[PDB]
Amino acid sequence: PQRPPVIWIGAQECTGCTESLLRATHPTVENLVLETISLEYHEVLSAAFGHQVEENKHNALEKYKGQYVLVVDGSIPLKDNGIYCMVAGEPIVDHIRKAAEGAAAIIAIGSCSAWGGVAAAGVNPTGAVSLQEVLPGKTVINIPGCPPNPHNFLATVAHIITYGKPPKLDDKNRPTFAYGRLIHEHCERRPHFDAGRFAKEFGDEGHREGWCLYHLGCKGPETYGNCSTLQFCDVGGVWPVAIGHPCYGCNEEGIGFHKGIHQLANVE
């Protein structure tokens, strides 16, 4: 049978959001591209290059008009008329707005496209902004994290394919199955927080008993996500806090890349 089409464009990306797919198991990246979708444009994996791959993109935008999912990783730089990211001699903001015109659904994968992320931090050298800021007339589905667990993306695409609509979203257009709860309101170290059992430095006695990381700067009290339950890499038991390091707030605008690692979170 025919497979649902996808167009993937990278703006000011590090490629970590594409690389998340190479850790996925349900589906694996080979089953995603041979069975689940038709990946019509993706510069990291494409056999074609240069003029051939730009022709392939134009052909797919015409053939699949009103049908494809558009995915963007990385921030979009507006300073100096778009010149901080140029592909085929044109500002990436122009490639993204052209591709958005015919999209059935639009997804910002990662903190950079969802809210500006690391590339928009500090002084913001390039005037980097979010995908929603460049497409004010469109509903952008945000899948934040640096990078997210790849299944936060893959189960969102599967809901669009299988049931013909997006998953339920919060007021930041994030899927509720993945972002509907604070990490601290579903964390297995909450008993230690409640008892005042805290690690004070890495390698101290409390740290070596798996105690709460709040006083090392854990941002779980102010970050929405599924890192304590879904976790990462499908091996069991693997997320930052379980390994021994505080959450940094990478999902959440104003927390990750703004607050210091050891700065304390506000608690509701």
Partner: protein, 551 residues
């Protein structure tokens, strides 16, 4: 004279444009251009030194881990901190497993479709393809039944009419030399590679807390809590789980990746005679094993004018000769200050004025070593290890040459390694040697915990006044990496990254000298200037990373 542009170059990390002048079907001159900038050096300035590693790790998600590890080494250098040996063993296992994933994905997912014609694989006889590998490999998944299953997946994709990322490829090009059977073998191995690289990243995840972008480092060591008898920490059960994934990597690396490297060389022997980028090579030693940030398992060094017999060894990440020689220029880059700059005195002031052939044409800076252009990465790393007389490296190269000699009747000399295929060979040799690094460092960690050492972290102090400087070196998958930090009144006053793809991809320098990508393309034959596959073959051998090169 014809002028071509390749924009975008695909099957790399990030945003690259290549321009070529072609005279009578031969490249006469080339330009490399990084077309995206973020300003990561400016984003990390004016912060606490302890926070840099979490921010600058986001320079790149393909070479994840590498900028995190270089950043904590740079702060430890500035502050004069000696890292606990258990923190070294854990950092080393992460970097070796990550690099295994990186090299496998580069050979198969990024480079193989330059050399392999998927449509030709549909004409293959699966039984003849299997018979070709008898006495060449002991791999367990080279049967006719495996190859038939893979052929049927290609048949079903073509029949659908939806080729997607396999569409409008270079199928039938005159530079495609493999027979149908070898194209089918290569597609089977491309799919099998995706399982091996997933197991490598399961090693990284169990120590790092996730991948991409690990979260277990600190200025002063690691955040893993070692306690064999603890619930919820790094105990014997967790270490046993790590070992179960380390053990799954060797067979594919040795019986598939190493063999396919020899086979591609046997079918493409003119690619041993082109793609030379430089005559000088640099690598740093890697995998420290003592209590004082030294005693490396892999050696480093500097080769000048291709002379292995007179190279200069580098055994310390504090080597003053290495430190003093490194500079970068922006004469042909989109930055304001153009004279060569030592990185502790570096600036990154954007000055975009559009493309000029003789002026500025890239966001990449131009690095030099005592005023010379230098190639970094697996070809440099392999040549330095051969100059050191490392038996493990000579023996691994000799295993690749024995397979090549069985297929062709010819040997390989060291002069033939200064080439597009020599660069690919150096990357495979590295991936093979890293499996013994993993076994060695897992055993070291188990033994050291057994002696009663559970230490992982030295808490830093950072003086609130004064100005002091540090540098962190690391041998990354693409070559020598360095992060340069200046601290003033307790915060970062300067931060400069000099990254391996900066050395190789940078544009013409302050003396208009040509760097490795641009020099490698001179002489390249181009059969069809509308479809310049031969140019992309040589550029892909360097494993370009433009998020890395530009940051």
């Amino acid at each position: 004279s014809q002028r071509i542009t390749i924009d975008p170059v695909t099957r790399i990390e990030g945003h690259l444009r290549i321009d070529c002048e072609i005279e009578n079907g031969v490249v006469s001159k080339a330009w490399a251009s990084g077309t995206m900038w973020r300003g990561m050096e400016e984003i990390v300035k004016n912060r606490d030194p302890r926070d840099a590693w979490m921010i600058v790790q986001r320079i790149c998600g393909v070479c994840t881990t590498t900028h995190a590890l270089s950043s904590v080494r740079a702060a430890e250098s500035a502050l004069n901190i000696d890292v606990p040996v258990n923190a070294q063993y854990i950092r080393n296992i992460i970097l070796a497993a990550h690099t295994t994933h990186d090299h496998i994905v580069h050979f198969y997912q990024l480079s193989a479709l330059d050399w392999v014609d998927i449509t030709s694989a549909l004409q293959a006889d699966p039984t003849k393809a299997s018979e070709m590998l008898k006495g060449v490999s002991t791999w367990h998944l080279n049967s006719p039944e495996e190859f038939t299953k893979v052929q049927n997946k290609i048949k079903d994709l073509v029949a659908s009419g939806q080729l997607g990322i396999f569409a409008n490829g270079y199928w039938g090009h005159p530079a495609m030399k493999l027979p149908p059977e070898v194209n089918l073998i290569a597609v089977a191995h491309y799919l099998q590679a995706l399982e091996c690289q997933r197991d490598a990243n399961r090693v990284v995840a169990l120590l790092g807390g996730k991948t991409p972008h690990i979260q277990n480092l600190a200025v002063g060591g690691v955040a893993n809590p070692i306690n064999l008898d603890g619930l919820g920490v790094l105990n014997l059960e967790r270490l046993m789980y790590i070992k179960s994934f380390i053990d799954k990597l060797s067979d594919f690396v040795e019986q598939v990746y190493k063999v396919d490297t020899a086979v591609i060389a046997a079918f493409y022997p003119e690619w041993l005679t082109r793609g030379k980028g430089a005559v000088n090579y640099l690598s740093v030693p890697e995998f420290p094993t003592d209590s004082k940030n030294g005693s490396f398992l892999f050696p480093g060094g500097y080769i000048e004018n291709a002379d292995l017999s007179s190279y200069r060894p580098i055994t310390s990440h504090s080597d003053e000769y290495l430190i003093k020689g490194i500079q970068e220029s922006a004469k042909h880059s989109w930055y304001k200050d153009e004279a060569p700059q030592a990185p502790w005195e570096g600036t990154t002031i954007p000055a975009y004025d559009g493309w000029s052939d003789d002026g500025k044409y890239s966001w990449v800076k131009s690095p030099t070593f005592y005023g010379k252009t230098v190639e970094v990465g697996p070809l440099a790393n392999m040549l330095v290890k051969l100059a050191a007389g490392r038996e493990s490296t000579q023996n691994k190269l000799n295993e690749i040459v024995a397979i090549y000699q069985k297929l062709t009747g010819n040997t390989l000399e060291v002069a033939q390694l200064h080439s597009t295929l020599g660069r690919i060979i150096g990357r495979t040799v590295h991936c093979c040697e890293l499996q013994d690094i993993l076994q060695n460092q897992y055993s070291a960690l188990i033994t050291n915990i057994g002696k009663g050492d559970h230490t992982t972290f030295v808490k830093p102090n950072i003086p609130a006044t004064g100005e002091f400087k540090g540098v962190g070196f690391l041998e990354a998958p693409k070559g020598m990496l360095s992060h340069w930090m200046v601290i003033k009144d307790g915060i970062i006053s300067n931060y400069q990254a000099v990254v391996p793809s900066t050395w190789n991809s940078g544009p013409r320098n302050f003396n208009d000298d040509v760097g490795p990508y641009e020099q490698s393309l001179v002489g390249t034959p181009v059969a069809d200037p509308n479809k310049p596959l031969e140019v992309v073959r040589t550029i892909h051998s360097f494993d370009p990373c433009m998020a890395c090169a530009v940051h």
